[PDB]
């Protein structure tokens, strides 16, 4: 490069990784020093332009040359944004004579952007164990029956005039005639999970567990809560939970673990004593009497048959959060003996909550996604973080969760459907996560990922729940036609991308299943061993991620987007590590010349494909590696 009235986008780069930001999660008193990369001697001037919420105006901070990278290929321009309590957003204006280019969260641009600027949210912190961990999701009843004595039997009890049905382990999940899909139980419980911690924390290596509902409820999924204060008898009791939490936190059976619980706070089941539609309690619920001490916990349009609920389901009456200081906000999160704080406090001390249907939480029966909804979650945050500043908060949202995270006063992250699940699904399987035809090329994939990451602050990005699938969508293995290689590719990408790798029990070995409830089959433990290639790779990958901080909290730079050969290469890097990931989304093999010079990997230095053990030597900024179709290489140094 040179001073030639031309700013070369290729050399330009910046994100909030260690090399470019010395304060990614600053306090009110820490200033943020930014570094921008450009080809050596490529520009003439560069400036940081930031909008400060303090005075609603833009501010200018001319940058100065700071240094060259070890390979003398790039320049690092420096500039500092002053320390203060206010949220700020910035972008860079890069000049080279008569040529100007802009750069922000969405990369280089010819015209000045007005959205996707980088974020600086003082005092906003997301739990680092979440950024650096690997999560494992479990749908309780279908993981492992560790205690058959608490098993729900056929006919044990009935719900809304329908007996429960028990299935032999491994059988189909669909209810037989006379029964209901939501009342089919396989016997999965807490003792079961406790007995299989070794497989989770050692065989795989995951250090975080997220469980679907485990509180008293009549269904098998349990989102129709009957009592948040008691573990459903079928899964055990509260002391069984205490034991499990102790074994999860234990460092004597593997790495230190963390437990995240599903919080269904937008509604309750219709059989919860506060509502008591079927009169299962001597107390009087809202449905039973307009005098009920809990009458105002709900919204009735025409008492008692017509009332607000979750998406029209009468079994899920919607809670009325009213205004600040309301009884409802008290039992859910404000009171020390509320659902949220009870489990966050001893003798439970869980590590976080997954906010179910979080966007709908509101007052008076409205559907949220408004001021009230956001006011509630920001109070929810103070409450949780007041009890444990390291307790994670991850909300369920299928689109852009920027409105619930970009101000650092609500959730730490969100279920990454839009930023991970969908793009990965369409790129590798040619299907969206509902299994309908939807394909995207590599260039598109890379563009989809960049735009979605730009929707969130860096610490949020690094805390997003990235799963290939879950209890509400179809199995990745099913969307791929059983082609286990597509699972390999998915895993390698998932374990090396930005965000919390999240495995939905079964995906690690390639489990199938279509739309609910078929996406909640019982875990086949004969497949749960390294003899299964998917499992072995999963474990291998998890070890690799835990080995390099760069894969968890490092920068991310796109390296190759080849739609012809279907090759995707990106680099994860920081002050100490440079890692080039090369993915082959094609069905045949391809030899790729990886431009590792982009990550400043010195010539003559060696790299190692952590996935095969095979080592390579960097020569002329490149590294040639052969990669099978639907597979990948993780060149690290």
Ligand X SMILES: OC[C@H]1O[C@@H](O[C@H]2[C@H](O)[C@@H](O)[C@H](O)O[C@@H]2CO)[C@H](O)[C@@H](O)[C@@H]1O
Ligand Y SMILES: OC[C@H]1O[C@H](O[C@H]2[C@H](O)[C@@H](O)[C@H](O[C@H]3[C@H](O)[C@@H](O)[C@H](OC[C@H]4O[C@@H](O[C@H]5[C@H](O)[C@@H](O)[C@H](O)O[C@@H]5CO)[C@H](O)[C@@H](O)[C@@H]4O)O[C@@H]3CO)O[C@@H]2CO)[C@H](O)[C@@H](O)[C@@H]1O
Ligand Z SMILES: OC[C@H]1O[C@@H](O)[C@H](O)[C@@H](O)[C@@H]1O
Ligand U SMILES: OC[C@H]1O[C@@H](O[C@H]2[C@H](O)[C@@H](O)[C@@H](OC[C@H]3O[C@@H](O[C@H]4[C@H](O)[C@@H](O)[C@H](O[C@H]5[C@H](O)[C@@H](O)[C@@H](OC[C@H]6O[C@H](O[C@H]7[C@H](O)[C@@H](O)[C@@H](O[C@H]8[C@H](O)[C@@H](O)[C@@H](OC[C@H]9O[C@H](O[C@H]%10[C@H](O)[C@@H](O)[C@@H](O)O[C@@H]%10CO)[C@H](O)[C@@H](O)[C@@H]9O)O[C@@H]8CO)O[C@@H]7CO)[C@H](O)[C@@H](O)[C@@H]6O)O[C@@H]5CO)O[C@@H]4CO)[C@H](O)[C@@H](O)[C@@H]3O)O[C@@H]2CO)[C@H](O)[C@@H](O)[C@@H]1O
Ligand V SMILES: OC[C@H]1O[C@H](O)[C@H](O)[C@@H](O)[C@@H]1O
Q: Which residues contact ligand U (rule: CB under 6 A)?
A: 181-182, 221, 223, 264, 310, 313, 316, 356-357, 396, 398, 471-473, 514-518
Q: Is 310 within 8 Å of 357 (Cβ atoms)? A: yes
Asked whether position 587 contacts ligand Z by CB under 6 A, the answer is: yes
Q: Using the rule CB under 6 A, give the single segment among 109-117, 137-145, 441-449, 477-485 that binds ligand X.
A: 109-117
Burial class of residue 85 in the structure, from the number of CB atoms within 10 Å of its CB (0-12 exposed, 13-18 middle, 19+ buried): exposed
As a whole number of Å, the end-to-end CA separation of the chain is 27
Binding residues for ligand X, rule CB under 6 A, total 8
Nearer to ligand Y, 66 or 112 (CB): 66
Options 483, 516, 518, 562; binder of ligand Z; rule CB under 6 A? 483
Asked whether position 549 contacts ligand Z by CB under 6 A, the answer is: no
**Spatial CB neighbours of 107, under 8 Å, sequence gap ≥ 6:** 9, 450
User: Which residues on adjacent β-strands are paired with residue 352?
Assistant: 260, 392
**Beta strand 313-317 pairing with 413-414:** unpaired
Options 145, 268, 359, 637; binder of Ca ion; rule CB under 5 A? 145
Nearer to ligand Z, 348 or 485 (CB): 485
Query: Which position's Cβ is nearest ligand U?
Result: 223
* Two structure tokens written together for 526: 């004969």
Q: Is 204 within 8 Å of 535 (Cβ atoms)? A: yes
Asked whether position 6 contacts Ca ion by CB under 5 A, the answer is: yes
Asked whether position 378 contacts ligand X by CB under 6 A, the answer is: no
How far from 115 is each of 32, 50, 103, 266, 459, CA to CA, in Å? 20, 12, 11, 32, 19
DSSP string spanning 453-469? HTTS-HHHHTT-EEES-
**What CA–CA distance (Å, rounded) separates 397 from 342?**
25
Please choose, from the candidates 297, 234, 225, the residue with its C-alpha nearest in 3D space to the C-alpha of residue 261.
225
Radius of gyration of the chain (CA): 26
With CB under 5 to 8 Å by kind, the binding choice for 517 among ligand X, ligand U, ligand V, none is: ligand U
Burial class of residue 378 in the structure, from the number of CB atoms within 10 Å of its CB (0-12 exposed, 13-18 middle, 19+ buried): middle
User: What string marks each residue from 391 to 410 as x (binds ligand X by CB under 6 A) or -?
Assistant: -----------x---x----
Q: Is 604 within 8 Å of 545 (Cβ atoms)? A: no
Options 8, 117, 426, 507; binder of ligand X; rule CB under 6 A? 117
**HSE of 547 in the Cβ direction (CA atoms, 13 Å)?**
15
Q: Is 517 within 8 Å of 174 (Cβ atoms)? A: yes
Asked whether position 228 contacts ligand V by CB under 6 A, the answer is: no
Between vectors from CA 78 to CA 15 and to CA 99, what angle results, nearest 5°? 80
Asked whether position 115 contacts ligand X by CB under 6 A, the answer is: yes
* CB of residue 452 to ligand V, shortest distance in Å: 6
Options 163, 451, 514, 595; binder of ligand V; rule CB under 6 A? 451
Q: Using the rule CB under 6 A, give the single segment among 28-36, 58-66, 288-296, 331-339 that binds ligand Y.
A: 58-66
Nearer to ligand Z, 292 or 487 (CB): 487
Asked whether position 593 contacts ligand Y by CB under 6 A, the answer is: no
Asked whether position 142 contacts ligand Z by CB under 6 A, the answer is: no
H-type helices in 140-289, by residue range? 190-195, 197-198, 238-249
Options 333, 427, 448, 573; binder of ligand V; rule CB under 6 A? 448
User: Which residues on adjacent β-strands are paired with residue 501?
Assistant: 466
Options 541, 630, 632, 635; binder of ligand Z; rule CB under 6 A? 630
**What CA–CA distance (Å, rounded) separates 364 from 299?**
6
Nearer to ligand U, 119 or 310 (CB): 310
Asked whether position 129 contacts ligand Z by CB under 6 A, the answer is: no
Nearer to ligand Y, 75 or 247 (CB): 75
**What CA–CA distance (Å, rounded) separates 355 from 338?**
15
Compute, in degrees rounded to 10, the torsion defined by CA atoms 29, 389, 138, 220: -130
User: What string marks each residue from 404 to 443 as x (binds ligand X by CB under 6 A) or -?
Assistant: --x-------------------------------------
User: What string marks each residue from 21 to 50 as x (binds ligand Y by CB under 6 A) or -?
Assistant: -------------------xx---------
Q: Using the rule CB under 6 A, give the single segment among 59-67, 163-171, 254-262, 334-342 that binds ligand Y.
A: 59-67
**What CA–CA distance (Å, rounded) separates 504 from 497?**
17
Nearer to ligand Y, 59 or 78 (CB): 78
Q: Using the rule CB under 6 A, give the single segment among 213-221, 375-383, 446-454, 573-581 that binds ligand V.
A: 446-454
Asked whether position 447 contacts ligand Y by CB under 6 A, the answer is: no
**Spatial CB neighbours of 86, under 8 Å, sequence gap ≥ 6:** 52, 53, 54, 122
Nearer to ligand U, 181 or 561 (CB): 181
With CB under 5 to 8 Å by kind, the binding choice for 115 among ligand U, ligand Y, ligand X, none is: ligand X
**Spatial CB neighbours of 109, under 8 Å, sequence gap ≥ 6:** 101, 102, 103
With CB under 5 to 8 Å by kind, the binding choice for 451 among ligand U, ligand V, ligand Z, none is: ligand V
Q: Which stretches of the chain bind ligand V, using CB under 6 A?
A: 418, 448, 451-452
Q: Which stretches of the chain bind ligand X, using CB under 6 A?
A: 51, 89, 114-117, 402, 406
Q: Which stretches of the chain bind ligand Z, using CB under 6 A?
A: 483, 485, 587, 628-630
Q: Which stretches of the chain bind Ca ion, using CB under 5 A?
A: 4, 6, 42, 96, 145, 147, 150-151, 187, 189, 276, 279, 281
Q: Which stretches of the chain bind ligand Y, using CB under 6 A?
A: 40-41, 64-68, 75
């Amino acid at each position: 490069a040179a001073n030639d009235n031309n700013v070369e986008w290729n050399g330009l780069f910046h994100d909030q990784g260690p090399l470019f930001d010395n304060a990614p999660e600053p306090t009110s008193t820490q200033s943020v020093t930014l570094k921008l990369r450009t080809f050596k001697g490529d520009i003439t001037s560069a400036n940081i332009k930031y909008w400060d919420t303090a005075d609603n105006a833009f501010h200018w901070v001319p940058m100065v040359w700071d240094s060259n990278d070890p390979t003398g290929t790039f320049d690092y321009w420096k500039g500092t944004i002053p320390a203060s309590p206010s949220i700020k957003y910035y972008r860079f204006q890069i000049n080279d004579g008569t040529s100007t280019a802009w750069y922000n969260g969405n990369g280089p641009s010819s015209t000045e952007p007005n959205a996707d600027d980088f974020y600086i949210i003082p005092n906003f912190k997301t739990p680092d164990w979440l950024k650096n961990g690997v999560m494992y999701q479990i749908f309780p009843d279908r993981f492992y029956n560790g205690d058959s004595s608490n098993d729900v039997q056929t006919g044990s009890y009935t719900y809304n005039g329908t007996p429960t049905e028990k299935k032999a382990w491994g059988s189909s999940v669909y209810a037989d005639p006379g029964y209901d899909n939501s009342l089919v139980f396989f016997g999965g419980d807490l003792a079961g999970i406790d007995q299989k911690l070794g497989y989770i924390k050692k065989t795989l290596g995951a250090n975080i567990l997220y469980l679907n509902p485990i509180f008293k409820a009549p269904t098998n999924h349990k989102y129709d809560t009957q009592d948040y204060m008691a573990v459903d008898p079928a899964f055990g009791d509260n002391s069984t939970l205490q034991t499990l939490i102790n074994d999860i936190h234990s460092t004597a059976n593997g790495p230190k673990g963390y437990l995240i619980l599903d919080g269904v706070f937008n509604h309750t089941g219709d059989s919860h004593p506060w509502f008591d539609k079927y009169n299962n309690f001597s107390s009087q619920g809202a449905y039973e009497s307009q005098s009920s001490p809990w009458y105002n916990y709900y919204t009735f349009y025409t008492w008692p048959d017509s009332y607000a609920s979750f998406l029209g389901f009468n079994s899920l009456p919607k809670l009325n959060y009213g205004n600040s200081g309301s009884a409802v906000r008290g039992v859910i999160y404000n009171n020390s003996n509320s659902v949220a704080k009870t489990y966050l406090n001893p003798p439970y001390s869980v590590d976080g909550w997954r906010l179910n249907a979080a966007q709908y939480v509101d007052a008076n029966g409205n559907n949220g996604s408004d001021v009230t909804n956001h006011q509630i979650w920001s109070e929810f945050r103070n409450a949780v973080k007041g009890v444990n500043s390291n307790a994670a908060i991850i909300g369920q949202y299928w689109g852009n969760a920027n409105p619930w995270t970009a101000q650092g006063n609500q959730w730490d992250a969100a279920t990454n459907f839009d930023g991970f699940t969908q793009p990965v699904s369409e790129w590798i399987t040619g299907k969206d996560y509902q299994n309908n035809s939807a394909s995207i090329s590599t260039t598109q994939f890379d563009s989809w990922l960049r735009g979605t990451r730009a929707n969130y602050p860096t610490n949020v990005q690094q805390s997003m729940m990235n799963f290939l699938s879950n209890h509400d969508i179809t199995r990745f293995a099913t969307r791929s036609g059983g082609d286990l290689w597509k699972t390999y590719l998915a895993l390698i990408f998932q374990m090396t991308y930005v965000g919390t790798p999240t495995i939905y029990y079964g995906d690690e070995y390639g489990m199938q299943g279509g739309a609910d409830p078929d996406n909640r089959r019982s875990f086949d433990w004969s497949q749960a061993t390294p003899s299964n290639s998917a499992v072995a790779l999963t474990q291998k990958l998890i070890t690799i991620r835990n080995q390099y901080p760069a894969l968890r909290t490092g920068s991310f730079m796109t390296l190759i987007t080849d739609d012809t050969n279907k090759i995707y290469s990106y680099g994860r890097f920081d002050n100490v590590n440079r890692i080039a990931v090369v993915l082959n989304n094609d069905s045949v093999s391809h030899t790729v010349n990886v431009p590792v010079w982009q990550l400043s990997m010195p010539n003559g230095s060696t790299v190692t494909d952590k996935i095969t053990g095979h080592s390579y030597t960097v020569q002329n900024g490149m590294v040639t590696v052969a990669v099978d179709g639907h597979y990948g290489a993780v060149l690290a140094q």
